[PDB]
């Protein structure tokens, strides 16, 4: 039987903490910090660059705005529609979420990246031109709702 005295960690799972500042044999004295300086007693911040204009100030701010109202779609490709539904059939947002192709509460859009070979009655907030075309070509229907 296995026991609490038989339980061990996995090989290489646990590593010995590095005891810095304990004798010269290990990381001793300066404790891996070297001799005098700022870094011998403090951590210099990430944004400081010696006093010259930092890279986060001498470079221009990226152009544009974020458009608070942007409507973004969780996308599923028709190749994934094929893989998830070899039998075809009705494929709504609920079906896609069940098969784990889109987030549960989101605006679903369908894109034609893979290839479609089965009759699918897909129903998503929007369809790319290629996705609609493939859905129709496979004998299915793409009801945008």
């Amino acid at each position: 039987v296995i026991k609490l005295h038989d339980l061990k960690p996995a090989p290489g799972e646990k590593k010995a903490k590095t005891r810095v500042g304990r004798g010269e044999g290990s990381k001793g004295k300066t404790a891996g910090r070297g001799t005098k300086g700022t870094k011998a007693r403090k951590n210099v911040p990430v944004m400081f660059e010696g006093g010259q204009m930092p890279i986060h100030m001498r470079l221009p701010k990226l152009k544009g705005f974020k458009n608070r109202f942007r409507t973004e779609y969780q996308v599923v490709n028709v190749g994934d529609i094929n893989k998830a539904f070899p039998q075809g059939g009705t494929v709504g947002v609920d079906e896609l979420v069940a098969k784990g192709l889109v987030r549960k509460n989101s605006l679903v859009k369908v894109l034609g990246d893979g290839k479609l070979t089965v009759k699918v009655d897909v129903t998503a907030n929007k369809f790319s031109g290629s996705a609609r075309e493939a859905i129709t070509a496979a004998g299915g229907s793409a009801t945008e709702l």
Binding site: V46, M47, I55, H56, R58, L59, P60, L62, K63
Partner: protein, 63 residues
């Protein structure tokens, strides 16, 4: 305490699909008269941040 993101870096750098950090070039805001359009185009758009600054830019963007 959540690690706060550097606002300046967040506003001046971006990641692509693969994860490359991109930035716009300096020297395109003003004093554009004497700049030949070839220089202005060279400065136009985004380029990957140099490998040297990639580390600190990534640290500022993550936290």
């Amino acid at each position: 305490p959540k690690a706060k993101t550097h606002s300046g870096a967040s506003k001046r750098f971006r990641r692509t699909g693969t994860g490359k950090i991109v930035r716009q070039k300096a020297n395109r805001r003003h004093l554009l008269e004497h700049k030949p359009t070839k220089r202005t185009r060279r400065l136009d758009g985004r380029t990957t941040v140099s490998a040297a600054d990639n580390s600190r830019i990534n640290k500022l963007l993550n936290g």
